[PDB]
Amino acid sequence: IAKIQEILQRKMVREFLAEFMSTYVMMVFGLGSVAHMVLNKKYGSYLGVNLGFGFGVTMGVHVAGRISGAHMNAAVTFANCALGRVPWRKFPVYVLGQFLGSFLAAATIYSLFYTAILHFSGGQLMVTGPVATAGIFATYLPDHMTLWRGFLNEAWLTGMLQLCLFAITDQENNPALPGTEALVIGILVVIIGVSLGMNTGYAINPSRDLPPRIFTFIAGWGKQVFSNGENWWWVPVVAPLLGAYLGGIIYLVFIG
Amino acid sequence: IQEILQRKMVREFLAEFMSTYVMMVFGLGSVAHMVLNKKYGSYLGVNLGFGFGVTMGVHVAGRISGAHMNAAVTFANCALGRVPWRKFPVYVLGQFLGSFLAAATIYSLFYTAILHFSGGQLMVTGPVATAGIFATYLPDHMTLWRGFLNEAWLTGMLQLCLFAITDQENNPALPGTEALVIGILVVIIGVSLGMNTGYAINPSRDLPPRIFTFIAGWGKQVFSNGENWWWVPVVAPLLGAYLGGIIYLVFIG
Amino acid sequence: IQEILQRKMVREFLAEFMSTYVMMVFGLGSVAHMVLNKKYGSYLGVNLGFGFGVTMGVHVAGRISGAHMNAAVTFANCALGRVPWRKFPVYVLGQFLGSFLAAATIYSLFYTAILHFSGGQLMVTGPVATAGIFATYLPDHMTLWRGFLNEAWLTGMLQLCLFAITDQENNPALPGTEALVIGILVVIIGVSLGMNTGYAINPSRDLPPRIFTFIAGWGKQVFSNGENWWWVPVVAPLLGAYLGGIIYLVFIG
Amino acid sequence: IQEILQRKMVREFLAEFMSTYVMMVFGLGSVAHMVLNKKYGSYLGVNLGFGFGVTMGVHVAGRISGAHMNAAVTFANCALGRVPWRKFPVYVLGQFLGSFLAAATIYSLFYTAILHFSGGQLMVTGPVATAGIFATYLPDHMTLWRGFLNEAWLTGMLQLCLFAITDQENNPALPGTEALVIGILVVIIGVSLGMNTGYAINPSRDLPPRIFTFIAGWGKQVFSNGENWWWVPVVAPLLGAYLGGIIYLVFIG
Amino acid sequence: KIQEILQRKMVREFLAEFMSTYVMMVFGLGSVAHMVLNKKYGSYLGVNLGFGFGVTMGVHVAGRISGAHMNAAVTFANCALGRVPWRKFPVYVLGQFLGSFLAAATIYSLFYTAILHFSGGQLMVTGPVATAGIFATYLPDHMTLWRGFLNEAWLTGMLQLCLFAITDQENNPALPGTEALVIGILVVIIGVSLGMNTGYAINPSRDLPPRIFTFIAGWGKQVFSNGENWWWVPVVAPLLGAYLGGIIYLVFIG
Amino acid sequence: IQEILQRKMVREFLAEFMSTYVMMVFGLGSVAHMVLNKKYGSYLGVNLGFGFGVTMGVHVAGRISGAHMNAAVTFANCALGRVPWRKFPVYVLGQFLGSFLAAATIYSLFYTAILHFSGGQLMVTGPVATAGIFATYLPDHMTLWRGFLNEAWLTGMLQLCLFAITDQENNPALPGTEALVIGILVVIIGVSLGMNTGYAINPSRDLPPRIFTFIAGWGKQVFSNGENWWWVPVVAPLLGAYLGGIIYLVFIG
Amino acid sequence: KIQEILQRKMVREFLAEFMSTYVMMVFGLGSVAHMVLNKKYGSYLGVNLGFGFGVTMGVHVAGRISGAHMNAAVTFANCALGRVPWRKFPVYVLGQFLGSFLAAATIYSLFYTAILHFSGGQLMVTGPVATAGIFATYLPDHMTLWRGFLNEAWLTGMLQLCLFAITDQENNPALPGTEALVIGILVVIIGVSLGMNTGYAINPSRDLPPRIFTFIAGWGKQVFSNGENWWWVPVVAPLLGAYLGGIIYLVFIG
Amino acid sequence: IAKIQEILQRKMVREFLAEFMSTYVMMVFGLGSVAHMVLNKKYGSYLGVNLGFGFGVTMGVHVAGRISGAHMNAAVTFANCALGRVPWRKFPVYVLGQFLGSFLAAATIYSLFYTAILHFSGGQLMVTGPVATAGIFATYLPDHMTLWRGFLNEAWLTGMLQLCLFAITDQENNPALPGTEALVIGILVVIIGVSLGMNTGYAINPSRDLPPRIFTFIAGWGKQVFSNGENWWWVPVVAPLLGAYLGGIIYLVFIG
C-alpha cells in the first residue's frame, strides 16, 4: 500500500533523516578508529583516531550539507539557535536525530568488533583496569586530571571549534571555496584532535558522548560508567554549550 | 587496428582494465611493503596506498566508463537502473584481467624479498606466510558469519558514501576534485574498519589474486583455508552495495 | 564603542591577533603532546599541528590584513614596497599579544600533565625539561652560527614559496584553496628541515612564549641557555625572508 | 641585466633551476632526517617530503616551462612531439645545476649531525654509512637486473599517471589544483613501490648528488658499489617513461 | 606439661617435614609471584633460582631428623624400594601437605595489594590478567593432556635418579655437609632445561594444596576443571616417574 | 697505642665495623648500578651483590665476633641468651658507623653519574629520584601496615634459616663453607620476597644511609615520605628475628 | 638370571658411560630447545648453565666406575697419553654414542608439539624458523670453515688443560667430593666466554649422534651438506685440540 | 735433548711458567666474555662479563696455585712483596710472566674473533665512535667521567680486592676450607665486577690493562689508544699499586 511517501516528503522529516544519517556515518567511522586503537597494537594509533574522526565529519557534511546544514553536534545547534541563525523550534528535531544516530552507531560498532572485544578483555566487561573496554564508546577522565580542569578543557576546545567553523563558512569574509568546505572542516577536526586531545579525549560533542554511554550501560558494562571519576558524565554535556556560544559571540563581535 | 580500437565497448573495456590495474598495483605494493619489511611498512601506509590508488584510477578512466573498479559497485549501479545490464560482463572481465596482471607484476617486482623473507618456502599459514599479500584471510578470533557481516556492512557504507559524494542535485564535490574525496573515503574505510577482514570490499580485489597464488605455487590451501572463506568476499559485497544504494536513494535522495 | 571598532587599523590589529592566537594554540598543543606523552605524540603530529593551524588562521583573517602571522614576512613585505611602513608596528604588536596569550592558554590547559611529568620542578634543561614546549632551544650537537644559517635559509625558502603560491601573474593556487597549500608548505618545512633548530622561522613564535616562561617560574636560564640563543630566531628570519623575496622577484617574477 | 635576462630561453632555464632546487632540498632533507635520527624520522616523512616538494616546485615554475623537474619526463615529452628537441639541453642543464646545489645546501646544513652520527668517518657501506642520503644504492638481497626492471616499471607508472592528470580532453584535475594531485601521486609512488631500489626514478635526482659525494670526500666507491649500480638510474627511467607515455597515448588517449 | 608430646619421634619427624616444606614453598611461590606480577623485578631464571635453592634450606632444616624429602613422590619411591617403613608414609605426606597449604596462605597474604593492582580487582584463572598460576600449574596452549603426563613422569624420573646418585655412599657421592648445594643445583637445572612444557610441578605437595587454597580463597572452581581436568596428572604421574627412576638406578648403576 | 688495639672489646668493635662496611659497599654499589645505568643494571645483580657481600663479611669477621652485621640478629641472639647483653651497644655502634661510611664511599664514587642522571637536582620522589640508592622507600600500592608485616616475616625467615645452617647438633654446613650458604640464603631472600618493601631487613642497612642522605642535601623529605616510613624497618626486624629464632628453637631444636 | 653377565667390569663401565652421557645430553639439549623455541623462557646463560651443570650430575652418576669422560675427545687424549688402556676406547665411545642418540630422541619426544607450533609444521635446516640447530651445531653466517676448525681445536685444548689441572693430585686440586662443581663451572664459563662463534661443540658425542637422529627423523640430508660439509669438523678438530692441551699441561705445569 | 730439559727443572723457571699459564687462562676467558658482550646483542650481557672475568681466576688458581700462589696481578705481587710476604727477587719474573701471558691472550682473542670484529666494525678499526672495538682488549674512560675520579675508583676497588684476598686465605683468622678457596676468590671477583665496575671498566690489574693496549697499538688501532681521554693509559698502572698496598696494610693492622 502506497501513500506513505506523503509522510516521507515533509520539510521536517527530511531534516530529521539528514541529521540521523550524517551523525550515524560520522560516529561509525570515529568509534571504529577508537576501537582499532584500543584493541590491536599493529593496526592502531592515535593519528588513525584523529584521521577517522575528522574525515568521518567530512563524509557527514557531504551527506547532509544542504538539507539541514550537517550540524552533527548538539553544541553547534545550540550556538546557532541562540545567535538567531536558526529558529528555536528546530532544536528538538535535530537533537533527537543526532541521539538516535549515535546510539545506533554504537550498537553497530559493538556488533562488528564482538569477537575481538571478548578476546582482548578475557570475557569480562570492565570499566577500569588494564583490560578496560568501556573507553571505546565514551570518554572517561584520566588519572591525574580533575573535574574542573576537564570542564575548562571541554569549554575551550568547543569554543575554538565554533570560532573556526564560523570563519570557514562565512561568505562576507574569506571563506573556503564552495564545494571544498568538507575537506577543510575535516582537517579542522583532525588537528583539534592532534593538538588538544590527550587531556580529556576531546568529546566536544554531547551526541558523541552520551548515547554511547547509555548503550554501554545497557549492554552489560554496569552502572560504573556513570559514577566513574566523580560523576564525569555530565561535564561533556554542559561544557560544550558554553564553549560554542562564547566562541561564536567572540567571532561575531571581533572579526565579523 | 585503429578501426577496431575505436569501438565504444573496446574503449570502456580498456578504461576499466587500466584503472583497475593502477589501483591494484598501488594497493598490493603497499601491502607487500607492510608484510615483508618492518621499518619500511605500516598499516597507515597500506591505507594510504589503497586509498589514493583509487584517486589515480579515477583520473585515468573517470569519464570514459565512470571508473567503478569494483564488481559490487557495477552490480549496484546496474541493479538500480543507472547502467545497462548488458555492460556488466565487459566491465567485470576488464576488472578481473587488470587485477590478475597487477598481482603478477607485484609478484615479479618483489620476488627476491619474498624468497628472502619466507626462507624459500611459499606458505599459506605460519609465522612466515606470504600468501596474504595477494588475497585476504580470516583472522584468528573471527568466524565465517562475523566476516560475512563485516564485508556486507563495509560495502554498504562505501556505496552510500559514493552515492553521496557524486550526487549533483544534493551537495556534491566540486567537479574536478571528486577523486581526492573518493580516495579519502577509501583511506578512512581502511583506517576505521579494516582489522576484522582486511576490508576486501571488492570481489575483483580478492578473487583474481587468489587464483594467481594458486597457480604460482602456493598450493590449493588458498581455497580451503578458514572453512572455505574464499567465497565470502565475492558474495557479501554485492548484497552490501545494493542495500546501501537503496537506503541512500530512499532516504536522502 | 562601535564606532572605534569599525576603524581600519583596529580591524587589522584584531585580525592579526586572532589569527596568531589560533595558529600558536594549535602548534604549541601539538608540541606539548609530543613532549609530555609517549603514545599520544609524534614529530609528524607537531608538523601537522603547526601547518594546519597556519591554514585555519589564514581562513580567519586572510582578507582583512593578509594573515601574515609572522614578523619576518611582514618585514619582507614592507621592505619590498608591498605594504606601507606605517602598518608594521600594529601588525607586530597584534602578533606578539596573540602569541603571549596562546602561551598562557597552553600553560593553563596542560598544567596537571606538566607537573606530573616534571615532578613539580620547572627545568629549562635536563632529562625532564619542559621549557621546550613554549620556545626553541639549541640542540646538543649544534653551534650558534650553524643555527643562524639554518634559520636564515629556512625563512628564505618559506618566503620564496609563499611568493610563488600567491602570485597572480605566475601560476597561483586556485583562489579559495590557498590556505591548504600554505598549510602543506609549513608541514613539509617542518618534516624536511626541522630537527636542527626546531624551525622557529617566526620571531613571534619564539620570543613571547620565552618571555612568558621567564615570567611564569622557569627562571632566567631561558635567555642565557646555549650561549644567549634568544636573539638568533629574532634576527636571522628577517634577513632570510628579505633575501628569499628579492631572489623570487628578480629571477622568477 | 634586463637585456640578458628577459629572453625566453634564459627564463625557462631559471624556472627549471629554481623548481629542481626547491624539490630536491625538501626531498634530501627528509631522507637525512630519516637516516641520521630515529625519533624525528620515518619513511612516511620521506614520502611526504618528496611529494610536496614536487608540489611546491610545480607552483614555482609550472607555467614558464611546464615544471618537468625530471630528465626522463623531458625525454618522454620530446620523443612524443610535445616539446621541441632544442629545449632538451637547457632543461637538463638547469635540472642538473639545481640538484647539485641542493645537495651542497643539504651537506652544509646537516654537517654537524653527519659528523656526529658517522663518528667522523665518511663511508659508503656499513652500519654507519651516510652516502645513502644523497644517492641510492642497491640493497642487500637485490641484483642488478631486478633493479633495472623496478626502475623502468616505476617510471612508466609515473609517466602514465602524469599524462592522465593533465590531459584536458579526458578527465583532468581542475586547473589550479593539479600541484596537489601530482604531489599525492609521488607520495603514493614512494609509499607503495619504494623499498626495493630507493625509487630514485629521475636521472636528475640521482647522479648530481652522487658526483657531489664523490667530490666531497666520500671516495670513488660511490661509482663501483653494487657492480656499478650508478648508471641504472640514468638509463632505465628514460625507457620506462617512453613506454608508459606511448601506452597511455595509444590506449586511453 | 606437653613436653612429653613434643619429645617423641614421630612428632619430631612430622614437624621437621612440615617446616622444610614450608620453607621451600615460600621461596618458590614468592619467585613465581615476582615473575608473574612485575616486569623489571622478575625473570624465569629467578624462578629457577628460588625453587632450586629453597630446597637447600629445607635440607639444612630437616636433613638429619627425617631426610628432608619435601616431596610425596620421593617418599613413595623410598617406601616402595625398601628404604623407609610403610608406616611413615601418612605422617610425612600429612606434614608436607599442611606446610604447602600454609606457605600458599602466607604468599597470598604478603602479595595481596600487588595481586589486586595487577589483576584490577578481579581474580581470573585464565586470560591476560590471570593470577591463579602463581599457586598451581596450568597446561600451556599447545600441550595436550598425555604429553603433559609424559613430561611429568620423565622429569620426576630424572630427579629421582639424580637424587639417588648424589647421596649414595658406595658410588661417587657429594662430600658430607655439601649435599644441599648439589641438590639445589639439580633442581635449578631441572627448572632451567625442562621446565616450560608443563611448569615442572614434579611434586604433588607443590601442586595440590595451593590449588585447594586458590579454590577456597575466591578463584572459583575453574581451578579444578581447566584444561580437561588437569589437576590429577601432577598427583599420579610423579609417583610412577620416581619409582621408575629409582629402579633404573638401582638395577644399572648401583 | 698498640695496647688498646689488643683488647677484646675493641677487636670485636673493629671486626663488626669492617664486615658491615664491606657488605654495605657491595650492596649499595649494586643498587646504584641498577638505578643509574640501564644496560649495566638488573635486579639479579642487586641480589648477587648483597648476598655475596654478606659472604665476604662473614669471611672477614666470622670468628672474632660471630659476623652478625645486623642489629636484628644481634638483638635476637642476645634475647635468646647466646650473647651477653653488655655487647649489644658496641656491636650496634660498629655496624652503624660502618654503614654510614659505606654510604659516604658510594656517594663519592658515583657522584658524576648521579649528577648526570638527575640533572643536578637531588629529588626524593619523581622520575629522576636518586634517594632510593641509599635507603628504601614504600612502593606505589603498598601501605604502612603491609610493609610492617612484610619486614617482620622476611626477617623471621632469615633468622630461622640462619639458625638452621649453623647448628652443630642438627645438620649444619661443613665448617669452612658456611659463608657460601649464608650468601646464597640472602640472595634467594632478595630474589623471592624482595619487591614489596625493598627487603631492607636490617636497621643498620637502612637508618645510617638515610641520615647521610639527609645531611648531604636530599632534604627532610627522606624522613617524612610514605607516612613516616623511616621507623618501620627499624622496629619490624627485631620482632621478626625474635619470633623466627624462638620458633626454630621450640620446634626443630 | 641376567645377573652374572651384568656384573662384569667391562659391562658396568659401558653402562656407566651410557647413563652419564644420557643425563648430560638430556639437560643440555633441553636448555638449547628452551632458548630456540620460546623467547621469554630462554636465554644464552640458561644454555650455559644447563650444559655446564649436566656435567656435574654425569660425574656424580659415573665418576668412580669409569671416570665419567662423557666425551670422545677426552677419552682419546687419555688413551693416547698412557693414562687409559687402548682396549677400553671402543666400549666407551659406543656407550657415549648410544647415550647421546637416545637423549636426542627423548628431547624430540618431549618438545614435539612446541617444535611443530614454532616451525609451522615444516622441519627446516635453514631460515628464520630453522629448528635443526636444537640438536646439532651449524656454522654461522660470516664464519668460514677453517676459522671454525681453529675455534674447535682451541676450545677443546683449553678444556683439556683445565680438566687436567682440576684433578691433579700432586698439583693443587679441588677437594675430593667437590670436584664436580668445579668441572661444571669450567664448562659454564667455556660456554659463556667462547661459545658464539661455533656453538662450542667441543664433544664429538654431542655433535654426531644428534645429527644422525635429525637426518633419520625427517630433517633431510641437508643436515650433512650445510656450510660446505661442516659435519666433520666437530669430530676431527677436538681430538687434536685435546691432545695438544694435555701435552702442554703435562710438559709445563705437571 | 736432556741438556735443555735441565732448564725446565729449576724453581724460577717453574714459577715463571706457572704465572704465564695462569694469566693466559684468566685473560682468555675474560676477554672472550667482553668480546661476546660488545660484538653480539643476544649472546652477550654484563653478567656474562662478570662471570667470565670472575671464574677465569678460579681456573688460573687451580692451574698455578701451589707453584707460585697464582697472583695473576701486578698490584697483588707488589703488595705481597712490599709487606714482606714474597722476596723482592721474585718480582720481575712474576711480572714478566704475567705480561707475556696477557699479551698472548690478547693475540689469541683477536685471532678467534677476527671475522666478527670486521663484520661489526665495517672493516675500520676505531678507538672511538658508535662502532668502536678497541675497548674489547683495554679499558677507556666513560663520557661524564674525569681522570682523577677514575684514579680514585681504581685505587678503592683494588684496595677492596686486596683486603678480601687477605681475609679469604688467612689461616689464623677465619679462612676458606683448603681445596675450596678458588671458588671464593672467583665469587669475590664476580661481585667486584657486579657492584662497582661500570665507572671505569674495573681494570684493577695492570697486567690486564697494558699488554692488550700495546697489542691494539701494534695490530692497527692506531696511536689514539694512548692519547684518548687525556692520556688515561697510565692510571690503571699506578692507581692499583697504591690501592692494593693500602688495603693490605689496613687488613694487617686492624683485623690481623
Side-chain angles (χ1 to χ4, degrees), chain C residues 118-119, chain F residues 122-131 218 221 225:
Chain C
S118 62
Chain F
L122 307 183
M123 295 295 299
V124 181
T125 174
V128 289
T130 49
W218 270 269
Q221 304 188 18
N225 185 273

Side-chain angles (χ1 to χ4, degrees), chain G residues 147 170-171 193 196 252, chain H residues 14 24 29 36 63 66 111:
Chain G
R147 294 280 182 176
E170 286 74 1
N171 202 19
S193 296
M196 80 172 183
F252 287 139
Chain H
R14 246 67 180 91
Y24 180 85
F29 281 119
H36 261 63
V63 164
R66 185 209 57 170
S111 302

Side-chain angles (χ1 to χ4, degrees), chain A residues 111-122:
Chain A
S111 296
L112 288 191
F113 286 82
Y114 184 74
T115 49
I117 286 174
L118 284 195
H119 172 38
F120 172 90
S121 194

